[PDB]
DNA sequence: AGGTGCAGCTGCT
DNA sequence: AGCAGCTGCACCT
């Protein structure tokens, strides 16, 4: 387990409170530091604390991998992305919340997708 | 630039994939310089051997469609392109844009030569129409005859021979088979007097073509200003911006036996008229004149109204 | 000596702006080299790159991007003939494009800041009193900088053309020919584009539209340009072509020069009781503007009555020709004409604006409409025209309704002679 | 001497846009009033089926991404539900004088090219090239995907001198394959007519009609257009198919590409069969380019060695240079 | 070795749009001049019935929202009141040559891909896939919601060679289920014909008619269209139905989806019904993906191990890859 | 679905 | 024993 997957798994999910059973709360408390504590917390502060501890040369990679594995099992809601690229057929679709589907937007590949993501923002 | 001795019809020329852009400022019908260059090429390839002169052209547009598209309900239009072959390395090439159109027109020509006296008229009309169906007019090829219909064979009207009542009835006869579309004429004097009317603010002439090709509404202190017809901005010749060079001076020239000059477009005004509302049919004809001492190379239609 | 902080601030902004690409493993000499080269010798680097660019108002690249030839900077002399619009009309309003390789274009920014803030835009090369206390250099460096920044306006090329350029032929009066090589009017296009985008959207053009929506419109102007077309130059990278091209975002707009009818729609003159007998008038969708002008055109006073009367006569004369072309292309275009719905009543329009004989041509079919008197159609058309031009005691009691009837009479008097030369 | 700095040739053998109509077999000889096929619209909805990224697969994310489908609106053209065949009609004219350029700078290069083409035509006619050009009219390669899966394709070709038919030809396009070039007793008359029109006298007009028995209510494949899309909330594309006057059609350059499929002399193999005659001969449906300039088998170096240095190539590779002189193009130094 | 960057296939089963008409049972042998089913519109007035977020679920807000009704206009298609059966008719053609791609960059990849498909067809024919394809024409699965609650469904299948009938089949679509694949004596002749078409040794064109007895004046279900503008309260059109020239119809891709409901080999279950063949075989009604890429059973893993590394993925899962190649698409990079 | 300029390399000389 | 070519990389709005 690397880090790029850590910031990916931190940003693509929603922010949820009380998303953990108490067994997983003590399981996570057994795998974190002594001083800091998480209780009645949301997702993003937990990701910020474990990212700050992994930026420090104090928490190991298997331990942060167990933390991010537990956060991967726990969170079940994802953010809907604004743009989606169909890759072999060279098409870019845009999400429309009124149809609950992706409608056709333009022709292009990965460079055009990165361009409209940088112009409009990645998530809804 | 004399009154022509005869008129020559070319009845229904269907052209496929002509050039639509025609100017750095307009995009509609092709420029009339294409039509005058076409009749000069036709003169060079026929009339030297048939002992005649062709100088005039009358553009009657029967119909017109363009390869355009309308994006997203926007108030603009784009051009449908073509797919070019691949590159030498084999990836793709950069795209240059050009517009294509399908038009159907008719062309009446003026003959001044002495070949009319010694040969039958229908032979000259048939040979000109047969030679004209093998070259192109605006960058697009001239389509030939289709089955299951009767084709139109062109005739040679004589203008300088006959009585005046027979003249007027022949000119009313030839206007029967050219009424579906309209004719295109030039309006330099109307643009000049409209510049001189509103000259109390800014005397730039380019702000006059951009004051007749719009919908201006100055409402009450809901009314639309009375358009006197169909005014269109057209290209009206060329204007030099470089001295005349020698036949060997400029490299990559098209021909090394003709002097060369750099050049800008000139923009004028034109109008689309019904063919009934003209006095005679020789008022329509387009001519071109050059002043090589200046840089003025201009085509227009003289002797109209 | 107060012009020494502007160029230093521009160099410092360029040096601090080269930090968005941060690499801590491939910057052993990249960061230090970018900081050291962009400190003092950046003026020499701009002077080395200034030779590629050229100040040009007529570019050759728009025609083709592969073509390499000769671009010209000139303002042509005014023509003698009246009624011609061109790039000669531009006076003080002219702007200059810059042509060359794209990597030199940022150096033009250092040549383009002299017209902003200070007044030494013509003081970079000559008049070095502002080029010494703000240059802060020696004499040889000042001479080299004056030679480098003066080369923007030079000729810079031998007179050449290309095989992908145009080079058309034009005929002389009774002689040979001339070769004409047209170029692209960059500056005229930029001026027309600046005049067009402000009319499309801006301060006063949108405020007058807000006054239009608030239904309280004062005397002011706003324009409307219908069915323009878009032409694109370059592609995804439009800075290769010209500096001016990038400003328009590698684009330019074209005005409609189209013929009177470019969108033909089939004409419904079939056997219909409401589309045959009631179709003796010809209510087309292109007569709404003429009808609206004829409706609100019959109220003017005698203080300006001449132009209004001439406009009404011109509108009627145009409205006759539209009906003539619609009769010539609508029934004459479709190769079929069956029996009308209610042939005892739908036969006037089916006889006048009807085709020739067909497969159902009976004995009294080709000997009825061509042998009878084709002169009732003029009075029938006048009866339709009488509804459009409103008459009452307000006009009939005055002396203007008599001329308004005489104009329609003089127009419909040719309706039997020009509309009666086919059969008879 | 050297190559002219401005060199250009004009397109001979130009077709028109072909038009598509529909009807029934065994009435195809009275197919002048057959109604045209029209372009309609329908809506499609699909799911994720593309090869997704090598580390963003994520078996809980793919389930969340499957619940939002794609949604489009496309143009489509079908045969009617009572019509059996498809008729495709176009016209072709052969223009003649296939050696003279449209633009040339020098006067010595022009006459050297003139005598080179003169020795070619004097040594052998246009008979091989016309025999290869008439194959793509005898079979029906110009209907590209409308030929796959048909059970009967026939082609009627008629020659037009005055406003009447001078001679007629009827072929069976499925017997004549798409791989070899063989000479029949009826294909030689058409080859001689094309070779006589291609030698300079005027122009020769032919009209080509193809009938394909495709099914009953099945879909047909006209050309589709290349546009730069809309970019707003609305429906951006219609996958736009090409039309002339409310009738589905094929472009002129696509039929011109189908007639040009000639050269089997390219040094890769004759396993792909013939390709189209291009300088640095490249295929758009293959992604790459044969006849590279690292070898000496492209158009430019062969013409440079044949005109300037006067070393004639093999008689097979002499046909390729004349082929893309008949094709046309713009070449400059 | 790696996969080519351009690799495309075309579909081998071509159906058309299935149009519908209506009539009476025990006259279905004279059902050639039955009148079509037309689309009408009507007005609906609904109420609120969705979940509330309990932030603005006040006791007065609900009663305020009840007084402002939502008024809409919908499209609807019913049977006539003197008719009780629906008739659905289309045609189908089977092309064959299902291993050769349409476009390919690499020539070293396509030769060994054709080698792999050739050893599959030589090892076992197209008999299993054609059996499962003929089952989905026997039980009338292409009537999606027009099949639930029906009293009796009957299917006629013809074989067309020229404008004649070569063979005829009649089936009871309700006796043959939607769960099992059991071989009859009359279904195996149709399976042999479809395999003969898919192999390449013959031209196969079928026409399929299905009769469904429902009731007098009951509602039928054609294909539904996309409405670009957002649904707008108070009189806006809300749904539209597909049509051809004043007759209701079903899209060709929807009756094509009901033919490739084949695979029971997905690792979740096999007794929960066959689903449609797809990469990462997914049902959008269920919102989940069987054949996840986390296992080794999607199309792009099995294809890239069968060709690049020569690892056969078991006979049961080898029909999945060939069915995906019969389906079509753009694979590769 | 960028054009232009330069550093580097080759290679038989 | 260098000329000519050629490829590939970077810059830029």
Q: Is the CB of C206 under 7 A from strand G?
A: no
Cβ contact C161–B251 (<8 Å): yes
Q: How far is CA D330 from CA B286, C164, C275, D4, D10, in A?
A: 32, 8, 56, 12, 9
* Torsion from C-alpha of C404, C410, C413, C418, nearest 10 degrees: -120
* Torsion from C-alpha of E191, E197, E202, E203, nearest 10 degrees: 110
The three-state DSSP-derived secondary structure of chain B is CCCCCEEEEEEEEEEEEEECCCCCCECCCCCHHHHHHHHHHHHHHHHHHHCCCEEEEEEEEEEEEECEECCCCCCCCEECECCCCCCCCCCCCCCCCCCEEEEEEEEEEEECCCCCCCCCHHHHHHHHHHHHCCCCCCCCCECCCCCCCCCCCCCEEECCCCCHHHHHHHHHHHCHHHCCCEEEEECHHHHHHHHHHCCCCCCCCHHHHCCCCCCCCCCCCCCCCCCCCCEEEEEEEEEECCCCCCCCCCECCCCCCCCEEEEEEEEEEEEEECHHHCCCHHHCCCEEEEECCCCEEEEECCCCC
SS3 content of chain E, % helix, strand, coil (to 5): 25, 25, 50
Provide the token pair at B253.
């020239």
Report the alpha-carbon distance of residue C231 to residue B97 in Å, rounded.
7
Give which of E132, C164, E123 is closest to D8, Cα–Cα.
C164
What is the count of structural domains for chain B?
2
Report the alpha-carbon distance of residue C158 to residue C71 in Å, rounded.
10
Conformational region of residue E84, where left means phi above 0, alpha means psi within -120 to 50, and beta covers everything else: alpha
Q: In chain E, how many H helices and how many E strands?
A: 7, 18
Report the alpha-carbon distance of residue C170 to residue E59 in Å, rounded.
86
Alpha helices in C91-241 (DSSP H): 105-112, 139-149, 186-200, 204-213
Q: Does D108 touch chain E (CB under 8 A)?
A: no
Give which of D44, D14, D34, D122 is closest to D84, Cα–Cα.
D34
Cβ contact D216–E207 (<8 Å): yes
Cβ contact B292–C178 (<8 Å): yes
Burial of B286 (0-12, 13-18, 19+ CB in 10 A): buried
Assess whether chains D and B touch, using the rule of 3 or more C-beta pairs within 8 angstroms.
yes
Q: Are D208 and D89 in contact (CB under 8 A)?
A: yes
- Chains D, E: CB contacts within 8 A come to 95
Give which of E139, E133, E140 is closest to E98, Cα–Cα.
E133
Report the alpha-carbon distance of residue B234 to residue B269 in Å, rounded.
6
Q: Are E72 and E238 in contact (CB under 8 A)?
A: yes
Domain extents in chain E: 1-10+98-125+262-333, 11-97+126-261
Report the alpha-carbon distance of residue C2 to residue C134 in Å, rounded.
6
Strand partners, E46: E70
Q: Does D235 touch chain E (CB under 8 A)?
A: yes
Provide the token pair at E245.
């020239």
Residue linked to tokens 């998303």: A19
Residue D45, number of CB atoms within 10 A of its CB: 15
Report the alpha-carbon distance of residue E332 to residue D169 in Å, rounded.
45
Is residue E272 classed as helix, strand or coil in its secondary structure? coil
Is residue E78 classed as helix, strand or coil in its secondary structure? strand
Residues B206 and B235 grouped into a single domain? yes
Q: Show residues of chain A in contact with E231, CB under 8 Å.
A: 98
Residues B90 and B238 grouped into a single domain? no
The spacing between the Cα labelled CA in E253 and the C1' in F2, in angstroms, equals 41
Is residue A94 classed as helix, strand or coil in its secondary structure? strand
Residue linked to tokens 């986390």: E294
Cβ contact D59–E289 (<8 Å): yes
DSSP C140-181: HHHHHHHHHHGGGSS--S-SB--TTS--EEEE-TTS-EEEEE
Q: Is the CB of C234 under 7 A from strand F?
A: yes
Q: Are C342 and C273 in contact (CB under 8 A)?
A: yes
Strand partners, B199: none
Q: Are C217 and C211 in contact (CB under 8 A)?
A: yes
Q: Are E220 and E107 in contact (CB under 8 A)?
A: no
Residues B250 and B103 grouped into a single domain? no
Last residue of a domain, one of B181, B213, B248: B181
Segment holding E208, helix H or strand E = strand E204-213
Report the alpha-carbon distance of residue E143 to residue E155 in Å, rounded.
11
Give which of B73, B38, B41, B80 is closest to B57, Cα–Cα.
B38
Last residue of a domain, one of B134, B163, B181: B181
Cβ contact E105–D42 (<8 Å): no
Q: Are E103 and D286 in contact (CB under 8 A)?
A: yes
Provide the token pair at B144.
């030939």
Residue linked to tokens 């605006």: B138
Q: Are C105 and C243 in contact (CB under 8 A)?
A: yes
DSSP E43-68: EEEE---S---SSS--HHHHHHHHHS
Residue C16, number of CB atoms within 10 A of its CB: 10
Report the alpha-carbon distance of residue E22 to residue E88 in Å, rounded.
9
Q: How far is CA D146 from CA C378, D211, D214, D246, E103, in A?
A: 55, 10, 8, 20, 17
The spacing between the Cα labelled CA in B264 and the C1' in F2, in angstroms, equals 28
**Please, which positions of strand F sit below 7 A from a protein CB?**
1-5
Q: Are B183 and B59 in contact (CB under 8 A)?
A: yes
The spacing between the Cα labelled CA in D283 and the C1' in F13, in angstroms, equals 38
Cβ contact C80–B296 (<8 Å): yes
Give D228-231 contacts, CB < 8 A, sequence gap 24+: D228/B78, D228/C232, D229/A106, D229/A107, D229/B71, D230/B71, D230/B72, D230/B74, D231/A105, D231/A106, D231/B71, D231/B72
Segment holding D263, helix H or strand E = strand D261-263
Q: Does D332 touch chain C (CB under 8 A)?
A: yes
Nearest CA in chain A to D62: A78
Q: Are E190 and E169 in contact (CB under 8 A)?
A: yes
Report the alpha-carbon distance of residue A89 to residue A104 in Å, rounded.
12
Is residue E9 classed as helix, strand or coil in its secondary structure? strand
| Cβ within 8 Å of residue E254, ≥6 positions away | E142, E144, E223
DSSP E154-196: EEEEEEESSSS--EEEEEETTTS-SS-----SSHHHHHHHHHH
Give resolution, Å, one decimal.
3.1
Last residue of a domain, one of B137, B152, B181: B181
Residues B37 and B176 grouped into a single domain? yes
Residues B171 and B23 grouped into a single domain? yes
List the single best residue of B14, B65, B78, B83 to mutate versus D (max D Cβ within 10 A).
B83
Residues B114 and B246 grouped into a single domain? no
What's the gap in Å between the CA of C385 and the closest CA on chain B? 20
Give E185-194 contacts, CB < 8 A, sequence gap 24+: E187/E131, E187/E134, E187/E135, E187/E138, E188/E131, E190/E134, E190/E137, E190/E138, E190/E157, E191/E127, E191/E130, E191/E131, E191/E133, E191/E134, E192/E127, E192/E130, E193/E159, E193/E167, E194/E94, E194/E126, E194/E130, E194/E133, E194/E134
Q: Are B82 and B73 in contact (CB under 8 A)?
A: no
Give which of D269, D277, D279 is closest to D304, Cα–Cα.
D279
Q: What is the DSSP letter of C225?
A: -
Q: Is the CB of B84 under 7 A from strand F?
A: no
Q: Which domain holds residue B63?
A: 4-181
For B68, phi then psi, to 5°, come to: -125, 170
Residues B30 and B121 grouped into a single domain? yes
Q: Are D155 and D28 in contact (CB under 8 A)?
A: no
Q: Are strands E204-213 and E282-283 parallel, antiparallel or unpaired?
A: unpaired
Provide the token pair at C415.
């309706």
The spacing between the Cα labelled CA in B229 and the C1' in G3, in angstroms, equals 68
Residue D173, number of CB atoms within 10 A of its CB: 22
Q: Are A89 and A106 in contact (CB under 8 A)?
A: no
Provide the token pair at B3.
């009154």
Q: Are strands B296-300 and E261-263 parallel, antiparallel or unpaired?
A: unpaired
Give which of D320, D316, D281 is closest to D303, Cα–Cα.
D320
What's the gap in Å between the CA of B82 and the closest CA on chain C? 15
Residues B28 and B58 grouped into a single domain? yes
What method was applied to determine this entry? cryo-EM
Q: What is the DSSP letter of C138?
A: -
> Cα C227 vs. chain centroid, distance in angstroms?
9
Q: Show residues of chain E in contact with D71, CB under 8 Å.
A: 226
Residues B40 and B122 grouped into a single domain? yes
Q: How far is CA E90 from CA D264, E136, E163, in A?
A: 42, 14, 16
Q: Is the CB of C102 under 7 A from strand F?
A: yes
Provide the token pair at E213.
């007895």
Strand partners, E169: E157
Report the alpha-carbon distance of residue E132 to residue B244 in Å, rounded.
81
Residue linked to tokens 């400022």: B25
> Cα A91 vs. chain centroid, distance in angstroms?
25
Cα radius of gyration (chain D): 24
Provide the token pair at D134.
């008439």
Residues B199 and B124 grouped into a single domain? no
Q: Are E216 and E103 in contact (CB under 8 A)?
A: no
Residues B188 and B171 grouped into a single domain? no
Cβ contact C164–D332 (<8 Å): yes
Residue B12, number of CB atoms within 10 A of its CB: 18
Q: How far is CA D245 from CA A68, B98, B139, D18, in A?
A: 63, 22, 22, 12
Segment holding D45, helix H or strand E = strand D40-46
Q: Are B31 and B43 in contact (CB under 8 A)?
A: no
Alpha helices in D199-328 (DSSP H): 252-259, 299-307, 317-327
Report the alpha-carbon distance of residue B112 to residue B130 in Å, rounded.
20
Alpha helices in C268-391 (DSSP H): 288-295, 305-330, 348-352, 376-388
Report the alpha-carbon distance of residue C31 to residue C18 in Å, rounded.
9
């Amino acid at each position: 387990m690397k880090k790029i997957e850590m910031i990916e798994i931190s940003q693509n999910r929603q922010n949820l409170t009380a998303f953990l059973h108490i067994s997983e709360i003590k399981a996570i408390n057994a795998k974190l530091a002594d001083g800091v504590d998480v209780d009645k917390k949301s997702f993003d502060e937990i990701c910020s604390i474990v990212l700050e501890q992994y930026q420090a040369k104090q928490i190991s990679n298997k331990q942060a991998s167990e933390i991010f594995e537990t956060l991967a099992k726990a969170n079940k809601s994802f953010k809907i992305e604004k743009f989606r690229c169909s890759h072999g057929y060279n098409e870019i679709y845009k999400y429309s919340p009124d149809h609950e589907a992706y409608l056709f937007y333009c022709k292009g590949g990965q460079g055009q997708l990165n361009k409209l993501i940088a112009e409009n923002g990645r998530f809804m | 630039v004399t009154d022509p001795e005869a008129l020559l019809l070319l009845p229904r020329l269907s052209i496929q994939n002509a050039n639509a852009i025609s100017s750095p400022l307009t995009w509609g019908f092709p420029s009339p310089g294409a039509f005058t260059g076409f009749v000069h090429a036709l003169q060079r390839r026929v009339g030297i051997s048939l002992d005649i002169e062709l100088d005039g052209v009358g553009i009657v547009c029967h119909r017109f469609e363009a390869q355009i598209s309308q994006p997203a309900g926007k108030r603009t239009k784009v051009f449908n392109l073509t797919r070019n072959p691949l590159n030498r390395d084999g990836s793709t090439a950069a795209i240059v844009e050009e517009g294509r159109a399908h038009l159907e027109v008719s062309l009446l020509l003026g003959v001044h030569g002495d070949g009319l006296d010694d040969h039958p008229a229908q032979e000259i009309a048939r040979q000109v129409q047969e030679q004209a169906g093998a070259m192109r007019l605006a960058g697009g090829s001239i389509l030939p005859w289709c089955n299951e219909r009767f084709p139109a064979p062109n005739a040679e009207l004589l203008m300088l021979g006959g009585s005046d009542e027979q003249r007027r009835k022949n000119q009313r006869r030839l206007t029967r088979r050219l009424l579906p579309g309209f004719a295109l004429v030039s309006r330099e004097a109307l643009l000049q007097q409209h510049l001189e009317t509103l000259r109390t603010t800014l005397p730039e002439a380019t702000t006059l073509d951009a004051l007749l090709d719009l919908c201006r509404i100055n409402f009450e202190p809901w009314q639309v200003r009375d358009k006197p017809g169909w005014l269109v901005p057209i290209p009206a010749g060329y204007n030099a911006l470089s001295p005349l060079y020698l036949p060997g001076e400029v490299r990559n020239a098209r021909d090394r036996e003709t002097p060369l000059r750099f050049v800008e477009n000139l923009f004028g005004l034109g109008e689309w008229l019904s063919p009934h509302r003209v006095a005679a049919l020789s008022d329509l004809l387009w001519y071109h004149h050059a002043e090589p001492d200046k840089g003025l190379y201009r085509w227009s239609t003289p002797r109209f109204v | 000596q107060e012009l020494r902080q502007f160029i230093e601030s521009f160099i410092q902004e360029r040096l601090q702006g080269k930090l968005d690409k941060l690499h801590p493993d491939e910057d052993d000499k990249r960061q230090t080299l970018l900081a050291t080269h962009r400190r003092e010798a950046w003026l020499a680097d701009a002077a080395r790159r200034v030779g590629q660019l050229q100040l040009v108002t007529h570019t050759l690249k728009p025609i083709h991007p592969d073509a390499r030839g000769s671009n010209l900077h000139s303002l042509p002399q005014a023509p003698g003939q009246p009624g011609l619009a061109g790039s000669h009309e531009l006076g003080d309003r002219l702007v200059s494009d810059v042509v060359g390789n794209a990597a030199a274009l940022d150096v033009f920014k250092f040549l383009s800041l002299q017209y902003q803030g200070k007044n030494l835009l013509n003081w970079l090369t000559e008049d070095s009193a502002e080029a010494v206390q703000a240059l802060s250099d020696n004499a040889e460096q000042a001479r080299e900088w004056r030679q480098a920044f003066i080369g923007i306006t030079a000729v810079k090329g031998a007179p050449a053309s290309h095989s992908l350029a145009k080079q058309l032929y034009f005929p002389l009066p009774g002689s040979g020919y001339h070769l004409l090589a047209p170029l692209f009017p960059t500056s005229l296009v930029h001026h027309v584009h600046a005049l067009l985008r402000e009319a499309r959207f801006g301060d006063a053009a949108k405020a007058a539209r807000e006054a239009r929506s608030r239904q309280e419109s004062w005397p002011h102007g706003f324009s409307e340009y219908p069915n323009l077309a878009i032409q694109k130059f370059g592609g995804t990278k439009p800075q290769n072509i010209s500096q001016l091209n990038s400003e328009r975002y590698g684009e330019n707009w074209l005005l409609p020069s189209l013929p009177p009818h470019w969108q033909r729609q089939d004409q419904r003159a079939p056997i219909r009781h409401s589309s045959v007998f009631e179709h003796d008038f010809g209510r087309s969708p292109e007569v709404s503007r003429l009808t609206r002008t004829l409706q609100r055109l019959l109220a003017k006073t005698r203080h300006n009555n001449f132009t209004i009367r001439r406009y009404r006569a011109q509108l009627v004369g145009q409205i006759c020709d539209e009906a003539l072309q619609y009769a010539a292309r609508l029934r004459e275009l479709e190769p079929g004409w069956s029996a009308t719905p209610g042939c005892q009543l739908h036969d006037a329009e089916q006889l006048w604006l009807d085709p020739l004989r067909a497969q159902t041509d009976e004995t009294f079919l080709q000997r009825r409409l061509r042998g009878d008197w084709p002169a009732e159609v003029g009075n029938r058309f006048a009866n339709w025209l009488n509804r459009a031009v409103s008459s009452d005691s307000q006009i009939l009691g005055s002396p203007e309704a008599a001329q308004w009837s005489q104009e329609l009479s003089k127009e419909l008097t040719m309706f039997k002679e020009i509309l009666e030369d086919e059969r008879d | 001497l050297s190559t002219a700095s401005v060199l250009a040739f004009e397109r001979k053998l130009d077709p028109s846009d072909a038009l598509m109509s529909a009807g029934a077999w065994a009435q195809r000889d009275a197919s002048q009033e057959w109604p045209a096929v029209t372009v309609r619209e329908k809506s499609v909805r699909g799911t994720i089926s593309n090869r997704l990224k090598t580390k963003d697969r994520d078996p809980a994310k793919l389930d969340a991404s499957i619940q939002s489908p794609n949604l489009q609106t496309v143009d489509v053209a079908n045969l009617p539900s009572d019509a059996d065949t498809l008729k495709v009609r176009f016209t072709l004219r052969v223009l003649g004088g296939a050696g003279t350029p449209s633009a040339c700078n020098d006067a010595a290069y022009r006459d050297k090219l003139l005598q080179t083409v003169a020795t070619y035509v004097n040594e052998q006619g246009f008979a091989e090239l016309a025999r290869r050009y008439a194959h793509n009219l005898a079979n029906a390669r110009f209907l590209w995907r409308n030929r796959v899966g048909a059970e009967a394709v026939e082609v009627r070709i008629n020659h037009i001198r005055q406003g009447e038919v001078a001679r007629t030809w009827r072929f069976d396009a499925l017997a004549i394959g798409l791989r070899d070039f063989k000479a029949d007793a009826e294909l030689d008359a058409l080859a001689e007519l094309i070779a006589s029109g291609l030698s300079g006298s005027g122009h020769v007009l032919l009209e080509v009609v193809a009938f394909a028995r495709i099914g009953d209510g099945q879909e047909v494949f006209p050309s589709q257009e290349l546009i730069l899309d809309k970019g707003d909330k609305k429906g951006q594309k219609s996958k736009t198919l090409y039309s002339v006057r409310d009738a589905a059609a094929i472009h002129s350059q696509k039929i011109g590409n189908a007639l040009r499929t000639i050269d089997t002399w390219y040094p890769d193999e004759d396993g792909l069969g013939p390709i189209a005659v291009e300088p640095y001969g490249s295929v758009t449906s293959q992604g790459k380019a044969y006849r590279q300039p690292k070898q000496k088998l492209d158009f430019y170096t062969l013409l440079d060695n044949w005109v300037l240095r006067d070393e004639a190539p093999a008689v097979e590779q002499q046909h390729y240079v004349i082929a893309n002189l008949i094709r046309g193009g713009v070449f400059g130094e």
